[model samples]
Target: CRYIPSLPDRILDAPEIRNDYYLNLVDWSSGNVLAVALDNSVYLWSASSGDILQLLQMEQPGEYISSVAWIKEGNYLAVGTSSAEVQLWDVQQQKRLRNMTSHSARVGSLSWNSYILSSGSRSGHIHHHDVRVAEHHVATLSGHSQEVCGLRWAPDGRHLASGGNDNLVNVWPSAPGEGGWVPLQTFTQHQGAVKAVAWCPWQSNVLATGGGTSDRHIRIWNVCSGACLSAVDAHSQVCSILWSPHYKELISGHGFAQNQLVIWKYPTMAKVAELKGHTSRVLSLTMSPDGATVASAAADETLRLWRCFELDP
Candidate 1:
């Protein structure tokens, strides 16, 4: 039986699903390459051709990949899994350099550096591994209640911000010779779990977060003072957040509910636009390096790309 429902005040379209049961999505450092996890394997695709460039099959659970990151220098890719490890892969030679197994629990999130690869585990433990030494566990941080859900290092590489299942947003500093990370502050205004955290890609210190239980609320934090700067009522169950580099606008969302995409702006918190398409809960999202495009996915099994052009205030 083909069941087609009426579009609810939004555009309803399905994307072409490349693989099944997607884990996450990442744009290559060059902004032309895109990598996504599908059913235990990681596939690298060319955005221009939509061609499957490479297929990386993981031995353990095939992938169980939770997070994927492109290093600053554009050489290695980091894959975090449910096994509490982040596998560092060298895409050029198609070899995995090392796995950072510092966390005693499942690895939940990850980010890359010129030399360091940051990973967070379901145990609420954060790890800073040196990639040059093949994922040498160098720094460790602990805070969240259960698992660290998402994290991103500040542009300066001096600070790290994370959100988690514990319902708190934390800021940590990476000081010289510190050997470890220190919590700068926490954002606890949300009444539910913090699903995602993002430091503005353009503005270094500004932070944004989304809630899991309720999609209607999004919060921004000021890193310097550790204060909840602003909160916006967005929609239902926003699962992720990202900042647009080209427009200085921040996006807070997850998947779509009732076929609508919810996005917000900072500095002056407002609903910049609501994408009315995509018939499923938006699973993963990312913006183009130049901030010209926005991509999102959901169980409806399609990846949708939106040309993001700015609107005047």
Candidate 2:
């Protein structure tokens, strides 16, 4: 009873999982499955059945996987690579369906809004692609001057938030009439790289982003009015963040010193608890559609599923 109740529910050895700090290498889909990217391949784990499946592997040398995302329909998954190619695969078919090649550089971050997939790259460009049509790409949004590392679309699909190593977090609205995406607001409060961005599940216009090594604070933003709502000093450098859909709580993984996971009550910004396990920095996090479990992947080459929060009945 002396320990925190937030220990992981299940721990899986991921010896091949990439330990990159800026890559989004893990995702949990609404289909009750988890997808993780290792060096040159992606693996799928069924959360409900505890089944593991190797989804895809790249034969090309030096072309490592960069990001993994599940489409809204939950029937397909998208994989991005260092070679600037995005591959879409059918989960049941276990076959590649479409290849989206638009970025000139590595696609570091990806966000899916309905049929549109927003891809961010190290070239400081964001490409919007419609997977349902032949002309896959729709438009390009330009802003960041450095590597774009974090990207997230609001639950309402009203806006897209992007963070980069340039230490900027840009709020881009889906304004098609104005032509493509334009920054509704550019926030540059962090001194280090901004790699972690999460939209509040309850508030469509609110967002939270975590800073890098030099800047360890998590800042919540009111996108509608362009204001910094509150900031929480996360202690260690933040690598990733996830907003709980069932409650007004948020969880963040860290780097360097602690590498622990901290849970917080949003708006109030109160520290609820901190869970420790990984020896190295934790870089990626994805939650189940039911919000009953959250999967955290770390630079320590492991993936952990946590029942860290209460499930409302």
Candidate 3:
């Protein structure tokens, strides 16, 4: 099943879940730190050293972990699970702090912004918590009509872009918690659902989003003009979108949607390449800040790493 120009060096021979997983996250602090949500548990690993940091096992009466995010600046992690709760762990200390935020259903994703920690559940609700406290609920972003699938903050830390089962990427500002969120703009070109949205680092208000349903593609849009200037269709239901501006590269995941990972020329609409090693669908993806490598986890019970560039030998 050689799908791309080269093979993604298998970083972990046997990823946890020993089967299909749902959510995972990478930590920049520990060089390729990966967190994978297995069927009943979640495992943390270091991509740089290939070391198993810890395996967060779940006992009875608990739910399957679905979303995990390594809060920047430390070893603290925020995890979301099917139990309708959010759990925070001090990785360095190996202690667990469970915050039952009470969601309508499962948690889809989680993100942190130094001050505001946000989590999006499957019930079309985006919950924000003030990390300054004991990870208490701060605000609930309400707008989407259906289940929200993804959540991402802007580079400036003033705005957020979201997508979901609804084919819309609505951008909102972070400010006075009162009225409805300020909708920056919406990118609507995909004929189906829009799963994820990624903003280019400190760029000219440009964002890249992956589509769900049958679109199986990625697109770049100008936030101000609401223009989708470029589109790349390499996967089926792209859930993760990570933009690397310094390297002029864009990476995305299709999960069960495409069964492949996609790389593109940032904001140019040029297709760089595609990688396939996971037997099942790719679940989550993220690239190292240095731009030297990429990490992907899949339902096939695998996590892989690959060089981002170099077309061929």
Candidate 4:
């Protein structure tokens, strides 16, 4: 039997992490670096050398980091701020490349597909920005009537899924239609705010989304057919969801009744293991480059890394 560690392998301090459910503050890069947003500053933690570096800090009084995402190349990072700007940074040089501004409110989610960066904002609009051009804003997607908190691009880069505070999940195609960008599928089954959205790495059309406190269920969807494949109640506020790249398993982060991480076998939705460490809500979860480790950031101001999946031999 393959053994999953019950305790985290490493723990680091992450002070002033926002407790808000709408903000995504943690992301692991393909280059094996973990980036976390804490208050107005962004920090980089290196998995190779176990070193920590302060990447950037907002000097403005009212400005704070709301989200962070790393590009596929792992040399650049996209940062969303309370001031409604998406800034791209060169990690190796530790320099800000450019700022793309359009959102009227704070940007809480960010996803990257090659040179294209997609950002979700409190104003409920999703912007697709092509980073190679001077006019980076390429398209605007409208569907959610409230804050857009969860945004993810499929592994194949053919589709994008977004979850919002309006209790809606919308899937859009990468290529725009004749008129403009619009949602190809809108799912309204969740009873609470939908924040956790993840696409299966092996199956690009398969998606998994979780609801907030009012609805503690995680629903798997077939994006191509717009059909709900399955739903499982987590019995707690489902904060984040991640699919194992090396195994047919799903991991969910939770709040309220229990602030623990639960791993479930896919399709069957059977509990495989439960990992408890965070004292508060587990806010964000990201997988390492190799997909063998998972790093979770919580409202308790701590970041814990766990070896949840065995390396594929």
Task: Give all candidates' CA lDDT scores.
Answer: 0.66, 0.86, 0.69, 0.93
| Highest-scoring model, TM-score | 4
Expressed as tens digits, the lDDT of each residue in 129-196 for candidate 2 is 88889989888989899888999999999999999999999999876546446798899998878888
Please report the candidate that would top lDDT against the real structure: 4
Model 3: how large is the Cα RMSD against the reference? 3.8
Q: Give the clashing residue pairs of candidate 4, or none.
A: none
Query: 2 or 4, which is superior by TM-score?
Result: 4
TM-score of each candidate?
A: 0.84, 0.96, 0.86, 0.98
Question: Per-residue error at 103 for model 2, in Å?
Answer: 0.8
Candidate 3: regions farther than 4 A off:
1-5, 13-31, 177-179, 255-258, 309-313
- Model 3 accuracy (lDDT, Cα): 0.69
Ranking by TM-score: 4, 2, 3, 1
Runs in model 2 with CA error above 4 Å?
A: 1-4, 177-180
Model 4 TM-score (2 dp): 0.98
82 in model 2: Cα distance from truth in Å?
0.9
In angstroms, the error of model 2 at 253 is 0.6
TM-score of 1: 0.84
Model 2 clash pairs are none
